[PDB]
Design a protein around this ligand. Structure first.
Ligand code: ATP
Ligand code: ATP
Ligand code: ATP
Ligand code: ATP
Ligand code: MG
Ligand code: MG
Ligand code: MG
Ligand code: MG
Ligand code: MG
Ligand code: MG
Lengths: 123, 123, 123, 123
């Protein structure tokens, strides 16, 4: 079923929970896990690589499976999921931008609206 | 992690895909799977029990684990998930009411907004 | 600008507020106001005509401007708005189905996603 | 009804349409119109004041009625709407960040979810 799982990580507490869920799902399904962190339109790259290092720490994936991407997060996630033929995307319901006002974060709404596979939302 | 999984089933093609995902997740995690179908505010009960029989067929769960509920679907799902201490809710992104116009069905939006655990959305 | 306004009415308290806003907007803009109420897939027709009579009471529109429609509410609203060349749709943020759980009701989400003109959301 | 209208402007084509609608609504209702532009967490201030100058150009409001705010746009808009006792908020359905993937932009979703008054969404 799930041979390749993609974790979208933003370093938020929701995303740290998602990382634990993604690691467990990969272990249960005998799947390859890829973690991605997008940085938006250097210092930005430094901070971003730090966030991605934490996702790699929490999930244990190899270096070629931890990717820094650029752009609107959801667009970057979807591109990587298509490129890596992900069978599941795991991401938080909300992130760093949460105010409790949206029903689901804007990047998770975008991914759920265009996802090429199931999406596991972690609160 | 996932010791109890709840599948919300409406008999839609999205929900039949979700049933396959839910069965696989239960097998992978060694989890107890519960399937629920809500009927809205008899003939209604007959049709509803038929839909639930199909969810039971597709997942193989025992009778006490296939439940007919009443009410706004999402409210019924959430009540059952709390009562059964579900660790994962699996449901389709859309259902019988799909027009392609919503970003996610209204029952899946409600469940994601108030879920007591992660939600796996199956397209 | 706004020569034709369409009010979507479901008889909810939000829709009664919307009716007052729609009447005021029509008066301010010198616009023709149409009110519509959709009934879903007789007794159903009786109840529906009652709800529409109340919208007509609250807005003062003539009979040919108060319409009963059938179908998924949002689809019916959008069809009428295109047919009547509405320049503004006025409707509540929520309705009879409100649980406080959605960010906006499912019929208002559908109309905002496909509207042929601006939409005035009344809380 | 509408004695004070607030226009949320981001300089997008949707927001230029919204500015025209807001100006017409203020003229029709004999209302005071306030325009606001939020800049996010200098050059940023320069660009932001330029965007706000365009909103002032398009609507004709006086200087004390054209405001630069800081923060998550929707939070800034809502704060200003409460402070100015707005009776209507006018804003686009989408903005500079549009990919066509969301049902409504994330700032418009936030404002509609917490608005202290009706919200007129301009496509
Ligand atoms: N830059 C990013 N890189 C990778 N994943 C991201 C990124 N941003 C968000 N995500 C994923 O999306 C999930 C949901 O967060 P999202 O950004 O949608 O909501 P938010 O930050 O609460 O609100 P906003 O819509 O203002 O961003 C995060 O938990 C994470 O899994
Ligand atoms: N009556 C129900 N009982 C159990 N699960 C349901 C029920 N209705 C919906 N669901 C679950 O919700 C999922 C998403 O469907 P949802 O009903 O949210 O969208 P829709 O039918 O496309 O639109 P609408 O918001 O008009 O119902 C379905 O695939 C199913 O998993
Ligand atoms: N049958 C209908 N006919 C005309 N307008 C309707 C109808 N149903 C809803 N509306 C319009 O949509 C507005 C928002 O209500 P909506 O039905 O979207 O939300 P809800 O009833 O709170 O939730 P649900 O998504 O469960 O219906 C109502 O205030 C009304 O203006
Ligand atoms: N910085 C801002 N200042 C004032 N109004 C804004 C600002 N950003 C957005 N808006 C208002 O919100 C409307 C809708 O745009 P919104 O920012 O919600 O969607 P988007 O830019 O398409 O997507 P994203 O959710 O990625 O921002 C804009 O047309 C404008 O009226
Ligand atoms: Mg975010
Ligand atoms: Mg449905
Ligand atoms: Mg309703
Ligand atoms: Mg419904
Ligand atoms: Mg924007
Ligand atoms: Mg954003």
């Amino acid at each position: 079923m799930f041979k390749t799982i993609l974790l979208a990580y933003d370093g938020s507490e929701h995303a740290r929970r998602a990382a634990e869920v993604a690691k467990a799902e990969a272990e249960a399904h005998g799947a390859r896990l890829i973690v991605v962190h997008a940085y938006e339109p250097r210092r930005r790259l430094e901070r971003a690589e730090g966030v991605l290092e934490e996702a790699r720490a929490l999930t244990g994936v190899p270096k070629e499976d931890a990717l820094l991407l650029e752009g609107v997060p959801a667009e970057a996630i979807l591109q990587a999921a298509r490129a890596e033929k992900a069978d599941l995307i795991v991401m938080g319901t909300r992130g760093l931008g949460a105010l409790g006002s949206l029903f689901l974060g804007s990047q998770s709404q975008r991914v759920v609206a265009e996802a090429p596979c199931p999406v596991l939302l972690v609160r």
